[PDB]
Ligand binder design. Structure first.
Ligand SMILES: O=C(CCl)NCC1CCN(S(=O)(=O)c2ccc(Br)cc2)CC1
Ligand SMILES: *CC(=O)NCC1CCN(S(=O)(=O)c2ccc(Br)cc2)CC1
Ligand SMILES: [Cl-]
Ligand SMILES: [Cl-]
Ligand SMILES: [Mg+2]
Ligand SMILES: [Mg+2]
Ligand SMILES: [Mg+2]
Ligand SMILES: [Mg+2]
Lengths: 226, 11, 235, 11
């Protein structure tokens, strides 16, 4: 990767996306990050889509195997452990990139909130498979990342901003699914939805489709949870 | 049914 | 290190991988099972085939997208575009070739010679024809000419056996004929042989339909319909 | 439109 120019790495990520080759896409984006320049919004999208496709596949697989393991010799456990280790690997790579290159005290609020959201998400994916004292530490790491992101977003972004919304949606999922905190999940989602709708008239047209998508998901989870 | 998180789409 | 693993464990893990939609793993498990050196069952030939065809199928789809971008780029002829897509198409191409070679290796080292019945021999020769055809799609050279020939020889040997040894409604025989017809049309530029082979195949099958179980009937007619779809396309 | 080959399903 490091022998390729940054512009070629970005181009090859876009090609890999067109080819539905998400592992390659992610490796290309990791090489691009390693060049040491900030990512644009478009580039953050490429990074996010790539690694979420990869981990998404691993999560679906882990869930299938875990279900079988719970219903049902040594093979299922062995194979679930193999998939789990691979998932933890990808999560560690992402968290590594966030810590070593992407998260900074400087730069605009959008970027800072995005990367802290991402940090929360990938710790959350680690928490889905963790059991130990390890699980407790992992959960605290997810909570800490999400909370920092929430604090910045409340200070620096409008309530209907799609990054702020996606962060809040994901933190609400954390509360419900990871932290055994349904009251806080529902309260955060309801507050988020209402505050977003109260300021929707100020939102730029370029964000409207995205913000309405996330507010629909807040509504749907609220229906599910209540 | 699991809760839905932010979808993996280009924003 | 699958050499020391229980064969039954490898098969079980291939089935777990299938349920988890982990097709690379599934293929690797079935390779390990093949390498134990025993013949495969019907279920195992299905697992082997499904696993590797999912893997190569994804690679083929990606290669096709990339080749099209490459060609469109080159036609436009803009003096700054093109190197990246070529290089990435070559990368995927290399991976596809490697999977095909693995499958051909298994067929040659373990499966074709060791088959004890006509049905499974024909399935493996068909497979050999298919994986050479997948190689042919990305080949260019004199290399392309040698690979096309290898595919044809594998398919012809399968057809020769299946005509002597199997009913015309047998799904293996039908799938072989379907695929050999696609070879003629898409690879060997022989649309007439394609059409002829598809027509003969469909008609000989049709004649014997009345003999089949309810379940067998559904299997055979599925492939006959694709034979039909192709004839509608080729005329 | 490409010709259809044998589908990748269990038979
Ligand atoms: O050996 C036996 C008995 N069972 C294996 C089985 C593997 C798949 N083959 S196949 O010819 O590749 C095929 C695949 C899909 C369709 Br639908 C039709 C035909 C048939 C035989
Ligand atoms: C401007 C900018 O930073 N854009 C890139 C981002 C990538 C995806 N994130 S997100 O994962 O928070 C998200 C939010 C909303 C949607 Br519809 C999808 C993904 C947001 C910004
Ligand atoms: Cl394993
Ligand atoms: Cl490349
Ligand atoms: Mg450089
Ligand atoms: Mg473990
Ligand atoms: Mg130009
Ligand atoms: Mg090549």
């Amino acid at each position: 990767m490091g022998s390729m120019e940054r512009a070629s790495l970005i181009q090859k990520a876009k090609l890999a996306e067109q080819a539905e080759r998400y592992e390659d896409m992610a490796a290309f984006m990791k090489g691009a990050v390693e060049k040491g320049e900030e990512l644009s919004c478009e580039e953050r999208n490429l990074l996010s889509v790539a690694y979420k496709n990869v981990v998404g596949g691993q999560r679906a697989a882990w869930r299938v195997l875990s279900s079988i393991e719970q219903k049902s010799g040594p093979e299922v456990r062995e194979y679930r452990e193999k998939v789990e280790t691979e998932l933890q690997g990808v999560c560690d790579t992402v968290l590594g990139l966030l810590d070593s290159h992407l998260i900074k005290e400087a730069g605009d609020a959008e970027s800072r909130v995005f990367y802290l959201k991402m940090k929360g998400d990938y710790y959350r994916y680690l928490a889905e498979v963790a059991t130990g004292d390890d699980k407790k530490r992992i959960i605290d790491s997810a909570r800490s990342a999400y909370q920092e992101a929430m604090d910045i977003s409340k200070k620096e972004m409008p309530p209907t901003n799609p990054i702020r919304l996606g962060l809040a949606l994901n933190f609400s999922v954390f509360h419900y699914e990871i932290a055994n905190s349904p009251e806080e999940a529902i309260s955060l989602a309801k507050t988020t939805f209402d505050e977003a709708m109260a300021d929707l008239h100020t939102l730029s047209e370029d964000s409207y489709k995205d913000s309405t998508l996330i507010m629909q998901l807040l509504r749907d989870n609220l229906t599910l949870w209540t | 049914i699991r809760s839905t998180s932010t979808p993996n789409v280009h924003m």
